[PDB]
Design a protein around this ligand. Structure first.
Ligand SMILES: Cc1ccc(Oc2ccc(NC(=O)c3ccccc3C(=O)O)cc2)cc1C
Lengths: 225, 206
């Protein structure tokens, strides 16, 4: 266990839009600066002995053009980042409801996962169309199917069993949740998984969140734990 | 404004220790701070207040008559199934007494965990599936929501935790998806109306 004590960090990346607005730029330039901040945080986590990093691109807590814009942002990010991740020995996984993504994109997600699946460095989980409540409900559906098959008794369902059906159950528990951008809310990111996690909120905007900020959040966890 | 506030009330043990007093004394100052927080929420039009003691039937019993007079609806949330049956009966009686009240709903967590709360709703749905009254593909967020604690109340708008720790500690999980989280180093027994107003400000600012 590294000195900072963290095996699994999750990050709500917020502030890309406010960052571009401060500079008189459109939202697109915030997205580009955001991506650069993702690469820097990935490389920092990998160099600092963290087992798993899970990232959530915050957009809002709420239309056609919205989803579509977010879908395109995911498409662009996946296409652009997967080779670099593979080359940094990162194992990539996507968590979230990808069921209604079109078959071609679902294929691209699957190939990106299979490519990096034997990587031994950081495990990087990227939330895409993810919500904490959906994650719980899909695990509940898996249990309900087992009941309907006659394989599972309602009274055998306990916390440990539902734990084994939510996303990331096979990785170290989430030790620390960082939210940048100044809001003090989880916004339907991980819920079940953050029952015992340290919550660390910083006003720094995502594109500005750098290695010293990440180091500060790890050290705060080391000191508070 | 803020309709439903939940508070993790931590710092009683540490407060006692700063005072050079035994744990018991801190419990007793924490109970005075409960009374103050309940009055403040009821005087300020908050619809629901949900309190979790992070570090009982007698305390409830001696306070229920006054809560009832103040039109407070008292509910206990959590697994009371292993409390002795006399105490279970007294909890049920206090709830039934105040159940018709239309002012502040005061939810007191007792042996509560946010994971436990979700699991109890899941077990209920699992029962319905096994009886053939429910298809697994029919299970959605609104449905599970209807089987977790407090689903008849306004969504939790704000969670306050006193005592300096920055964690939810398996208090509400499902219900805090969109809540403002407000952490204060103030120890629970010291937490007063000014501290409670500062938390409501953080909500109003956002
Ligand atoms: C390596 C890497 C790093 C960061 C990264 O950031 C993201 C993550 C997710 C989205 N979009 C959705 O999550 C989404 C997709 C469809 C519909 C709704 C949504 C929704 O945001 O709600 C955009 C950008 C992606 C990758 C691939």
């Amino acid at each position: 266990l590294p000195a900072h004590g963290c095996r699994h960090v999750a990050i709500i990346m917020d502030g890309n839009g406010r960052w571009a607005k401060k500079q008189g730029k459109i939202r697109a330039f915030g997205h580009k600066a955001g991506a650069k901040s993702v690469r820097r945080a990935v490389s920092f986590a990998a160099n600092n002995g963290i087992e798993a990093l899970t990232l959530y691109a915050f957009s809002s807590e709420n239309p056609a053009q919205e989803v579509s814009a977010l879908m395109e942002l995911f498409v662009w990010a996946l296409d652009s980042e997967v080779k670099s991740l593979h080359r940094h020995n990162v194992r990539l996984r996507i968590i979230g409801d990808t069921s209604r993504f079109n078959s071609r994109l679902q294929e691209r997600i699957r190939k990106s996962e299979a490519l990096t699946a034997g990587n031994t460095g950081l495990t990087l989980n990227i939330a895409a169309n993810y919500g904490g409540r959906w994650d719980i409900v899909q695990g509940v559906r898996q249990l309900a199917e087992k009941v309907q098959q006659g394989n599972l008794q309602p009274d055998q369902i306990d916390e440990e069993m539902l734990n084994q059906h939510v996303c990331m159950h096979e990785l170290a528990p989430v030790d620390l949740v960082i939210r940048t951008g100044g809001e003090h809310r989880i916004s339907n990111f991980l819920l079940w998984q953050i029952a015992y996690a340290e919550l660390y909120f910083t006003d720094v905007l995502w594109p500005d969140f750098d290695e010293q900020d990440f180091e500060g959040a790890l050290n705060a966890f080391a000191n508070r734990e």
